[PDB]
Design a protein around this ligand. Structure first.
Ligand code: HEM
Ligand code: HEM
Ligand SMILES: C[C@H](O)[C@@H](O)c1cnc2nc(N)nc(N)c2n1
Ligand SMILES: C[C@H](O)[C@@H](O)c1cnc2nc(N)nc(N)c2n1
Ligand SMILES: NC(=[NH2+])NCCC[C@H](N)C(=O)O
Ligand SMILES: NC(=[NH2+])NCCC[C@H](N)C(=O)O
Ligand SMILES: [Zn+2]
Lengths: 409, 411
């Protein structure tokens, strides 16, 4: 019922009570654990409950739980649901809902910043051009000349599943992927399929290695449209090393604004299918994963060669030596160009602090160890030795089907 | 019910059917996952089934399921159970049980070697002195002058829970740790408490930074006794770096035989409380955890100083650069002395093949991602990108409370 988590390095012991309020499922059972599995239209009777659940916590957060205002709202929404078969959140409810969806994101190590989220209410949007205007404004505001500020833009909620707003890109900004005749892959293998759909829709693919993909926007269920993000808005960073000057020769560059855009935001039962959000990078995301994953830009060997490391045997740890240098470079290049970025040590230390804060001020913090521990130097970051309890609270960010496997043209 | 796991790096999908034969719990519910949590006497009544399930799996494996020998053995066991409230395994079943406990250890990345396990039957042992002799033979056989061989020694099973055999050591070979009055710690911080017990039991600690702990053995529920492992049997490796001539001056060295000795081996419902086992090290266990955890030897700083890295700001990744060098040194020192050891790239690569093989020939491979992925360079090793299913099958290795917390002293 009441659980405890121990940090095996500091012997600290936090007591979790927040999970008692858990709602969704975890994908696990007493028989089997799926902790390492990537991913283990509502009716009126379904919505009333969710809505009630949300308002209670909302009014409870503003210290007016069971007030008249509280009861009034709950009554108004219930009426609206019976009549319209859905409802609209007050601006204050939206902001609270969004900030809390981020607060509950058990896979985000950067949640200590949760309360500072800038919310852009784009619920009055009606067309894809409108979406393009809203997104550009978001990118600009968040980039802030390098002094990144977290943000989220919320388009209209779902109604009947046939008038959904969606951003087909998985991130507002990403590099294109083209399968070459060589059999190899040019650019970013992760977006090969998305790139094909752009071309298949008209994009004039430049066929380069780091071509900023075009936004593909779907408004009110209509077919998606293309737009090219004002280049002057896409801040980028050329990657160099603070010692190896041959580094710049790999011709590597990465964008400064990470902005996940394919997720679904759920607040009080309502579903916001187009809700791009952004913060700033933790070095390892680019350095370790985007650059070295075998299925991404896989630049380990090349960097290994340039370093003249004995790549004859795995035990020389040449892959490890190289991995470290690529990550020093990334962090280096960003800090030099003066763009916000955080290293895995600093970030994890912050998350540990945030966890303790959460356990005392809220009674817990759902965390997914598998995703919290960085992809490099795991055990030398504090979160590795930190036991975690993973559970699903709402408001939340959910995964959702890539629209192309769903859109009825 | 069939379950599927994908590898996000090779898109290869596998199907798990083996989880259907899972029995024990996982600590998890549909409302909460505890996959990152360290750790979430039997009666005739409950023993009959456990014995039957075991004999069935055993007889199926030798391809004699349903045979007369299978049926007689099953009748033999039951008569014995209700006759004596327990039963004795045959040598072959014991060997099979041990090998499968290893095969089912979801936290072990070295399982590709499960079938080559050397099983030593010490079920005829009656005293602590007897246990010590058995333990010396295991260390000697397993070490094999540097060419390590996996092995396990199995002492008498639990009967009434008052006559238990236990190896109070957590590993047969491990360095002492001593709390200094100024708060610091000399030696290995992980063994401070056990070291204190050994001293209290009469051990004359030389108080150095790498003193091999004495064995503290409990036979048939009696009070534990001390034994010094013959020094000529404890193989050690001086730690030096292939290019940093100053590394050797750090005074570091490590033992070559990793032999966990505090677990419990469950086979056919029977409980073996003393079952030390050993294989060989994966570099990271020593170079990442034993040397760099802040709660172990914590040498990152010193190594860092000598290399003169920018230790002013973590964003220089100085910790990360030192970690790599230390692990390179560990792998290099063992290889030079010709002491079996395996780097994490090779072990995880090997474990991924074993796992695929296991799905194909067994219908699954229970695995704990949290423990399989190495403590450094996680995503550049194949297991990181591999979805896994964690569930517990028997035979199995279980945690058991430290004996000093439960032993009823005799004086
Ligand atoms: C400002 C600093 C931020 C940092 C350092 C941070 C860091 C991260 C990291 C390292 C992960 C895993 C990333 C991956 O491996 O793909 C993550 C996941 C996530 N973050 Fe954040 N984040 C930031 C801002 C945000 C914001 C503004 C939100 C939401 C409004 C958010 C919501 C989430 C969610 C839902 C996930 C999981 C996404 C998935 O499943 O792929 N993060 N974040
Ligand atoms: C062949 C050499 C071996 C290698 C390279 C290997 C590797 C490993 C590693 C790296 C771990 C995690 C270690 C830790 O963090 O403490 C592990 C866990 C484990 N191994 Fe092995 N192993 C070997 C042999 C064995 C043998 C012979 C057995 C069984 C008889 C075995 C049973 C286990 C079990 C039960 C665990 C989990 C222990 C726990 O929960 O603390 N391993 N092994
Ligand atoms: C989901 C799979 O186990 C594996 O692909 C995996 C594990 N942990 C992860 N953690 C983080 N932070 N990101 C990704 N992409 C991860 N991917
Ligand atoms: C049990 C805690 O989550 C943490 O201390 C933790 C995580 N992963 C591990 N993995 C391995 N291989 N060994 C140990 N000791 C580990 N310890
Ligand atoms: N720090 C963040 N907000 N990250 C969002 C996901 C970005 C993704 N992991 C990448 O490397 O591009
Ligand atoms: N590879 C093995 N069999 N390891 C057994 C556990 C050893 C433990 N990780 C140590 O560093 O001492
Ligand atoms: Zn679980």
């Amino acid at each position: 019922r009441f659980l405890k988590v121990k940090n095996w390095e500091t012997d600290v012991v936090l007591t979790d009570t927040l999970h008692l309020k858990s709602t969704l499922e975890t994908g696990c059972t007493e028989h089997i654990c799926m902790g390492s599995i990537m991913n283990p239209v509502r009716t009126k009777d379904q919505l009333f409950p969710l809505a009630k659940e949300f308002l209670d916590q909302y009014y409870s957060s503003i210290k007016r739980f069971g007030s008249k205002a509280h009861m009034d709202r709950l009554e108004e929404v219930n009426k609206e649901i019976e009549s319209t078969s859905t409802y609209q959140l007050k601006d204050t409810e939206l902001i609270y809902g969004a900030k809390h969806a981020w607060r509950n994101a058990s896979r985000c190590v950067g949640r200590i910043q949760w309360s500072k989220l800038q919310v852009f209410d784009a619920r009055d949007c009606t067309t894809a051009h409108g979406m393009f205007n809203y997104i550009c404004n978001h990118v600009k505001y968040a980039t802030n000349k390098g002094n990144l500020r977290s943000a989220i833009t919320i388009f209209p909620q779902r109604t009947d599943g046939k008038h959904d707003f969606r951003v087909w890109n998985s991130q507002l900004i990403r590099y294109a992927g083209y399968k070459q005749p060589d059999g190899s892959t040019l650019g970013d293998p992760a977006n090969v399929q998305f790139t094909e759909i752009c071309i298949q829709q008209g994009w004039k693919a430049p066929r380069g290695r780091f071509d900023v993909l075009p936004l593909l926007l779907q408004a009110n269920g209509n077919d998606p449209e293309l737009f090219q993000i004002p280049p002057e808005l896409v801040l980028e960073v050329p990657i160099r090393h603070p010692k190896f000057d041959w580094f710049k020769d790999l011709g590597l560059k990465w964008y400064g604004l990470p902005a996940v855009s394919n997720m679904l935001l759920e607040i009080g039962g309502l579903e916001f299918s187009a809700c791009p959000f952004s913060g700033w990078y933790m070095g390892t995301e680019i350095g370790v994963r985007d650059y070295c994953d075998n299925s991404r830009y896989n630049i380990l060997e090349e960097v290994a060669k340039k370093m003249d490391l004995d790549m004859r045997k795995t035990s020389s740890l040449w892959k490890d030596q190289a991995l470290v240098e690529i990550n020093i470079a990334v962090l280096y290049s960003f800090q030099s160009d003066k763009v916000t970025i955080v290293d895995h040590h600093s970030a994890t230390e912050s998350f540990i602090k945030h966890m303790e804060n959460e356990y005392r001020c809220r009674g817990g913090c759902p965390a997914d160890w598998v995703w919290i521990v960085p992809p490099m130097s795991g055990s030398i970051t504090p979160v590795f030795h930190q036991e975690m309890l993973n559970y699903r609270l709402t408001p939340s960010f959910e995964y959702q089907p890539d629209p192309w496997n769903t859109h009825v043209w």
